Every structure is written in C-alpha cells, then in structure tokens.
C-alpha cells in the first residue's frame, strides 16, 4: 500500500532492487541447494570414504 | 564360506514350477537332437535343429525374476 517507493515505484528502484537482490539471492540459493544434495547422498561421497580409511 | 549370490538366486527361482515348465521344455529339445548327430551321415544336411530358442526362453524368465532382487545382497 503505502510502501511503493520503498518497493517498486522508482524506475531506478524497479531495476535498482531486482539487480540488488540478484546477488543476495545468487549466494543463498547456491548454498541451500548444495546443502540438500550432500545429505540426500550421505555416505557415498569422498568425504565419507576418506574418514573410513583413517 | 559364502558362495556368489547370483547363482544362489538362479537356482531358488529354478525351484518354482514356473521354472520347471521351462527346464523340462529345454531338456526335451536336447534329447531330440542327440538321437541325431550320430545317425549315419551328416554333412548331408543343409539345416538341422538347435536348442537356442528354448535356451533363451529359460534365460529370459530367470532375469525377470532375479534383476530387482540382487543388489540388496551385494555391498
């Protein structure tokens, strides 16, 4: 409602926020996807086999 | 001490009569071609009987029965 120049009114905030979030989203989506993949396949990676030959 | 797992399952599914229907069908083929190949004269021939078709019918059933059942027995 009364948040529009805080959100998406300005030409330089319509592209000055979707370019701002384009790096914040770039690193937190990359970390959470990698964290899910290495627990669905836990026990088969090289990190788990090298700790078994200790 | 432990034999290999694929030949253990290959005989346990030969202990069904679904298997004995195909075991006996191939053994009947083998005893027809062997009262043959000793009768007097061959290299007379241009075509004679094999048992390759009856072989594959028994092999196909054994792989439908042991393929989803094996890799839980291996490490």
């Amino acid at each position: 409602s009364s948040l529009y120049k805080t959100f998406f009114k300005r030409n330089a905030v319509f592209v000055g926020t979707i370019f701002a979030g384009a790096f914040v989203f770039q690193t937190v989506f990359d970390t959470a996807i990698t964290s899910w993949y290495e627990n669905h396949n836990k026990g088969k990676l090289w990190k788990d086999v090298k700790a078994r030959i200790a | 001490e432990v034999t290999d797992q694929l030949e253990d399952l290959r005989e346990h599914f030969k202990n069904t009569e679904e298997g004995k229907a195909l075991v006996h069908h191939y053994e009947e083929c083998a005893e027809r071609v062997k009262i043959q190949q000793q009768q007097p004269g061959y290299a007379d021939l241009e075509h004679k009987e094999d048992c390759v078709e009856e072989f594959f019918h028994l092999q196909h059933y054994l792989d439908t029965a042991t393929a989803p059942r094996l890799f839980d027995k291996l490490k």
């Binding site: 088969k44 990676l45 788990d48 086999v49 | 594959f56 196909h60 393929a67 989803p68």
Partner: protein
C-alpha cells in the same frame, strides 16, 4: 534377424546412481580400480584417463 544374431536382452538391475538425485558410490569406484589392476589390465587399455 533372429534372436541368436541380435543377442540376449540385458535386464534392469537397480544401480545406486540411477535417478535424478543420485551420486556415484565412491567406495565402489575405489574397489573397482583394484579389479582393473589385478584382472583386467593384462589385455585392456585405459588410454583416456589421466
């Protein structure tokens, strides 16, 4: 052609790397090089692997 000239059809075993979310089993890659070095390398090459 006949089924003798085509070959038998291989069945569908359940490999641990089948699926869209699966990884190779690195303990079965390690043991697989031990069977290559002792049984297989007497007649076959592996020329593409550094």
């Amino acid at each position: 052609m006949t089924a003798a000239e085509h070959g038998l059809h291989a069945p569908a075993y359940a490999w641990s790397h089948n699926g869209p979310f699966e990884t190779f089993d690195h303990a079965s890659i390690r043991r697989g090089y031990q069977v290559y070095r002792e049984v297989c390398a007497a007649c076959h090459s592996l020329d593409r692997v550094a």
